[PDB]
Design an enzyme around this catalytic site. Sequence first.
Site, short mmCIF file in Angstrom:
data_model
loop_
_atom_site.label_atom_id
_atom_site.label_comp_id
_atom_site.label_asym_id
_atom_site.label_seq_id
_atom_site.Cartn_x
_atom_site.Cartn_y
_atom_site.Cartn_z
N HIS A 41 0.82 -1.21 0.00
CA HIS A 41 0.00 0.00 0.00
C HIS A 41 0.86 1.28 0.00
O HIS A 41 0.35 2.37 -0.22
CB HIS A 41 -0.98 -0.02 1.18
CG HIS A 41 -0.41 0.47 2.48
ND1 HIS A 41 -0.11 -0.38 3.52
CD2 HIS A 41 -0.15 1.72 2.93
CE1 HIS A 41 0.33 0.33 4.54
NE2 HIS A 41 0.32 1.61 4.21
N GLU A 55 20.18 5.17 7.21
CA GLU A 55 19.56 6.40 7.69
C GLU A 55 19.30 6.29 9.19
O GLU A 55 19.01 5.22 9.71
CB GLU A 55 18.25 6.67 6.94
CG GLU A 55 17.51 7.94 7.35
CD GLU A 55 18.27 9.22 7.00
OE1 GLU A 55 19.24 9.54 7.71
OE2 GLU A 55 17.89 9.91 6.03
N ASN A 57 18.87 9.90 11.34
CA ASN A 57 18.19 11.17 11.57
C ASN A 57 17.88 11.80 10.22
O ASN A 57 18.79 12.23 9.51
CB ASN A 57 19.06 12.10 12.41
CG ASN A 57 18.36 13.40 12.77
OD1 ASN A 57 17.57 13.94 12.00
ND2 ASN A 57 18.67 13.92 13.96
N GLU A 60 19.36 15.35 9.47
CA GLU A 60 20.80 15.56 9.60
C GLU A 60 21.59 14.65 8.67
O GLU A 60 21.03 13.74 8.06
CB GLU A 60 21.25 15.34 11.05
CG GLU A 60 20.75 16.38 12.04
CD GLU A 60 21.37 16.21 13.42
OE1 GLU A 60 22.13 15.24 13.62
OE2 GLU A 60 21.08 17.05 14.30
N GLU A 62 24.63 11.92 8.56
CA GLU A 62 25.43 11.03 9.39
C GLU A 62 26.63 10.44 8.63
O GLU A 62 27.48 9.78 9.21
CB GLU A 62 24.55 9.90 9.94
CG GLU A 62 23.44 10.37 10.90
CD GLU A 62 22.18 10.83 10.18
OE1 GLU A 62 21.33 9.97 9.85
OE2 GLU A 62 22.02 12.04 9.93
N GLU A 65 24.54 7.38 5.10
CA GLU A 65 23.40 7.20 4.21
C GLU A 65 23.81 6.78 2.81
O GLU A 65 24.79 7.30 2.26
CB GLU A 65 22.57 8.49 4.13
CG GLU A 65 22.05 9.01 5.47
CD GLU A 65 23.00 9.99 6.14
OE1 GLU A 65 24.22 9.97 5.86
OE2 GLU A 65 22.51 10.80 6.97
N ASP A 89 -0.50 -7.46 1.90
CA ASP A 89 0.14 -6.14 1.89
C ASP A 89 1.66 -6.27 1.97
O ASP A 89 2.27 -6.14 3.04
CB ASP A 89 -0.39 -5.28 3.05
CG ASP A 89 -0.04 -3.82 2.89
OD1 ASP A 89 0.46 -3.44 1.81
OD2 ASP A 89 -0.28 -3.05 3.85
N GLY A 183 3.00 6.06 8.56
CA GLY A 183 4.37 6.31 8.16
C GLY A 183 5.30 5.14 8.46
O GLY A 183 6.40 5.07 7.92
N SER A 185 4.45 1.96 7.90
CA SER A 185 4.13 0.86 6.99
C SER A 185 5.32 0.42 6.15
O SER A 185 6.11 1.24 5.68
CB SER A 185 3.00 1.24 6.06
OG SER A 185 1.80 1.41 6.78
N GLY A 186 5.43 -0.89 5.97
CA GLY A 186 6.51 -1.47 5.19
C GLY A 186 7.71 -1.77 6.07
O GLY A 186 8.58 -2.55 5.70
C1 LIG Z 1 0.68 2.67 5.12
C2 LIG Z 1 1.14 2.59 6.60
O1 LIG Z 1 1.94 3.66 6.96
C3 LIG Z 1 -0.06 2.56 7.56
C4 LIG Z 1 0.38 1.99 8.89
C5 LIG Z 1 -0.79 2.10 9.93
C6 LIG Z 1 -0.47 1.18 11.10
N1 LIG Z 1 -1.43 1.47 12.21
C7 LIG Z 1 -1.25 0.90 13.52
N2 LIG Z 1 -2.21 1.23 14.52
N3 LIG Z 1 -0.20 0.08 13.80
N4 LIG Z 1 -1.08 1.75 7.01
C8 LIG Z 1 -2.27 2.35 6.44
O2 LIG Z 1 -2.43 3.58 6.43
C9 LIG Z 1 -3.36 1.47 5.86
C10 LIG Z 1 -3.48 1.48 4.49
C11 LIG Z 1 -4.55 2.64 4.15
C12 LIG Z 1 -5.42 2.68 5.19
N5 LIG Z 1 -4.67 2.07 6.38
C13 LIG Z 1 -5.10 2.08 7.77
O3 LIG Z 1 -4.38 1.55 8.63
C14 LIG Z 1 -6.39 2.69 8.13
N6 LIG Z 1 -6.27 3.19 9.50
C15 LIG Z 1 -7.48 1.63 8.03
C16 LIG Z 1 -8.87 2.21 8.39
C17 LIG Z 1 -9.40 2.06 9.68
C18 LIG Z 1 -10.66 2.59 9.98
C19 LIG Z 1 -11.40 3.26 8.99
C20 LIG Z 1 -10.87 3.41 7.71
C21 LIG Z 1 -9.61 2.88 7.41
CA LIG Z 2 20.57 11.44 8.16
#
Ligand SMILES: *C[C@@](*)(O)[C@H](CCCNC(N)=[NH2+])NC(=O)[C@@H]1CCCN1C(=O)[C@H](N)Cc1ccccc1
Ligand SMILES: [Ca+2]
Lengths: 235, 51
Positions: A41, A55, A57, A60, A62, A65, A89, A183, A185-186
């Site tokens: 995603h 990476e 900071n 900054e 380091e 990088e 995902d 942020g 994710s992945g």
């Molecule tokens: C893409 C990643 O940065 C992010 C990570 C979120 C992890 N959250 C927790 N509590 N550990 N993932 C996302 O943003 C994914 C893909 C797009 C939507 N999404 C969500 O997590 C939404 N919060 C899902 C959702 C919940 C309730 C109502 C609508 C959507």
């Molecule tokens: Ca840096």
Amino acid sequence: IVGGEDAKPGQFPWQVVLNGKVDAFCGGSIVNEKWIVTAAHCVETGVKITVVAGEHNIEETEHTEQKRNVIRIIPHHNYNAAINTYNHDIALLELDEPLVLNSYVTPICIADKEYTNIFLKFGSGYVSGWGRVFHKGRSALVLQYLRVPLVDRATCLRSTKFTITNNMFCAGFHEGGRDSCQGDSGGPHVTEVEGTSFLTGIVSWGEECAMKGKYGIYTKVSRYVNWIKEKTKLT
Amino acid sequence: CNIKNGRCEQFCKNSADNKVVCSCTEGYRLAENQKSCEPAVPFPCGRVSVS
Ligand SMILES: *C[C@@](*)(O)[C@H](CCCNC(N)=[NH2+])NC(=O)[C@@H]1CCCN1C(=O)[C@H](N)Cc1ccccc1
Ligand SMILES: [Ca+2]
């Protein structure tokens, strides 16, 4: 990462950050010199993406990088087969030039399906990233990390009205307060086996962040290990 | 392999005779004690070396 703490330089040498239309918008982990594994995603569209290894900071310098361009993106073939579920995902990124491995740039280990699952069931993993440190809050400048316990499937299921597939697992605290977040994710969920870390999950999704009764939802890497090894072969 | 992974540091598989054959992930070599795992490259996966 909510409720975590600052990593030390080189504490997570497999961690990378993804930059693009949005800066520091997702994380990833080093499979080898040419390949990153991340969340699908993060990398929908054919938009240009850059990877930064070594990476720490993001504001900054380091002098550790290594920045690379992404020339090819392979989301899992079943990702977005069903809309808005975030099943499967996971995605692979090929770099234009190989990373130079060092103390700050090191691959994460990936075991077979059976041992990845065994390691997951150790019940304790580390997650890291430059995502939000407060819910609907600010993004981290210094890399954050957090230890999160495994949550049993039955509790996982009842925690949310959304679907939890067998390609997912829950992790977090019953009392809340500590979680991955937007942020992150992945980013890798890793299990340390006697000094050697193995990839056991990928930060995928959740409902808000760090809320009590809710858990972080992670891509179950054991289900994709064969796919990863097949696609990232070095020749 | 039943108890403590047949004392293998990483991977274990049942051979026969109720015996164990240990193995390691890429970048690591099976140490001569036939149980532990030793780095066979300068920067093996999953290891912190910044010191
Ligand atoms: C893409 C990643 O940065 C992010 C990570 C979120 C992890 N959250 C927790 N509590 N550990 N993932 C996302 O943003 C994914 C893909 C797009 C939507 N999404 C969500 O997590 C939404 N919060 C899902 C959702 C919940 C309730 C109502 C609508 C959507
Ligand atoms: Ca840096």
